[PDB]
């Protein structure tokens, strides 16, 4: 449901939507379907066991509250020794035996890897950071002088579609879904649904209203002030 | 499952149970069939729904430490709410219209009604303490110039059996189970159960053991200490 809005002009449902697609690549943050597996499965749950019956599950104890709770104080707890582990391994190397950042990435890594494993499954992040782009974006963040928080700060949000691999996005299939022609150009009201393979773009365009403006005179005569109380 | 432990000599178990049964009244608290209806339930609901399967018990959710650690806020909350009641309604009457501690509780309990009725129900005391016995420890509190707390730990804490109303506790049917007769003395290893009308006092007799002291002489000279570490 993360939802963004774009001002375009008179263009087609199809540049508009390559506009949006253009949009999403950078804006959208990436699809991670393992973030998605907790509803499924607790409707699964559901599924396992019309006014009254909701009217008990208010009554009944809110699971959800609870877990998405101790689950936050997991990802804090586990982002706090990631910085942590980052931080020292970062202070091991000196700017000035030589190295390349290449050989000081592998050298620092492993007194960071166990930390950033155990945050990228508790975010649920790991298949998305293979340890050798770990290592690459490690030399990277190595030779810009980077801090760990500026290495860091790709791993610990879910950051945009193009941070990631080139396999990651699948830019080649994406289904334009109109009710109407495609070459058709945008209007107020009209929906058309970029598919991608599992999540689907829904975008309603709307008109941006007619603004009517007009002066008044405020004059700074009038911006008087007494010390009373109001 | 409260339990204390007592010294006795050498008496039969039916003076035993006797003197359990004095130290009962006085020390235990009061038998609360309310506050025991939580379990059952609980076994009930487990009754509407084998070491794999306690394993699996253990990685659901623990829907207990929630429940006790909210109600644990919410009698903390109306606690917290009864003592403020009563400390305004205390200080709403002057020791010097004259009128009687019986009088004074009357015109100050309405201040303290609500709030005392909402934390014996969240403590499920409401069975115990009537109105009239709120009104009559109320004009005993205001008559011995006792403060609100001193009023209010009647009410805070479950408090044991001889707090409460004649009625209340059911000295008349009280029976001894003993494997042995009862008129025999006590020893190491027996059991005997002092049973009411829905609880039962579990009593098992051990000897105090025998017990060898010896001097050892420890000399004031060899208190000696030095600063340094250890």
Same mark, same amino acid.
């Given at each position: 449901?993360?939802?963004?809005?774009?001002?375009?002009?008179?263009?087609?449902?199809?540049?508009?939507?390559?506009?949006?697609?253009?949009?999403?690549?950078?804006?959208?943050?990436?699809?991670?379907?393992?973030?998605?597996?907790?509803? %499924?499965?607790?409707?699964?749950?559901?599924?396992?066991?019309?006014?009254?019956?909701?009217? !008990?599950?208010?009554?009944?104890?809110?699971?959800?509250?609870?877990?998405?709770?101790?689950?936050?104080?997991?990802? %804090?707890?586990?982002?706090?020794?990631?910085?942590?582990?980052?931080?020292?391994?970062?202070?091991?190397?000196? !700017?000035?035996?030589?190295?390349?950042?290449?050989?000081?990435?592998? +050298?620092?890594?492993?007194?960071? +890897?166990?930390?950033?494993?155990?945050?990228? !499954?508790?975010?649920?992040?790991?298949?998305?950071?293979?340890?050798?782009?770990?290592?690459?974006?490690? +030399?990277?963040?190595?030779?810009?002088?980077?801090?760990? %928080?500026?290495?860091?700060?790709?791993?610990?949000?879910? /950051?945009?579609?193009?941070?990631?691999?080139?396999?990651?996005?699948?830019?080649?299939?994406?289904?334009? $879904?109109?009710?109407?022609?495609?070459?058709?150009?945008?209007?107020? /009201?009209? #929906?058309?649904?970029?598919?991608?393979?599992?999540?689907?773009?829904?975008?309603? #365009?709307?008109?941006?209203?007619?603004?009517?403006?007009?002066?008044?005179?405020?004059?700074?005569?009038?911006?008087?002030? $007494?010390?009373?109380?109001?």
């Amino acid at each position: 449901g993360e939802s963004r809005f774009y001002s375009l002009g008179h263009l087609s449902i199809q540049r508009a939507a390559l506009v949006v697609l253009e949009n999403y690549y950078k804006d959208f943050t990436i699809y991670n379907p393992n973030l998605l597996t907790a509803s %499924k499965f607790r409707a699964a749950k559901h599924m396992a066991g019309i006014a009254a019956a909701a009217r !008990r599950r208010d009554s009944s104890h809110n699971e959800l509250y609870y877990e998405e709770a101790e689950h936050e104080r997991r990802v %804090k707890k586990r982002k706090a020794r990631l910085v942590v582990a980052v931080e020292e391994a970062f202070i091991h190397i000196q !700017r000035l035996e030589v190295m390349d950042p290449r050989e000081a990435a592998q +050298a620092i890594f492993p007194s960071m +890897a166990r930390a950033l494993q155990k945050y990228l !499954r508790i975010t649920r992040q790991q298949n998305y950071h293979s340890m050798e782009s770990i290592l690459q974006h490690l +030399a990277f963040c190595i030779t810009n002088g980077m801090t760990p %928080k500026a290495f860091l700060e790709r791993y610990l949000s879910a /950051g945009p579609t193009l941070q990631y691999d080139k396999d990651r996005w699948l830019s080649t299939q994406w289904r334009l $879904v109109s009710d109407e022609a495609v070459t058709n150009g945008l209007r107020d /009201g009209i #929906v058309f649904v970029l598919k991608c393979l599992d999540f689907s773009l829904v975008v309603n #365009v709307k008109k941006i209203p007619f603004i009517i403006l007009s002066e008044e005179f405020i004059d700074p005569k009038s911006h008087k002030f $007494v010390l009373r109380l109001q």
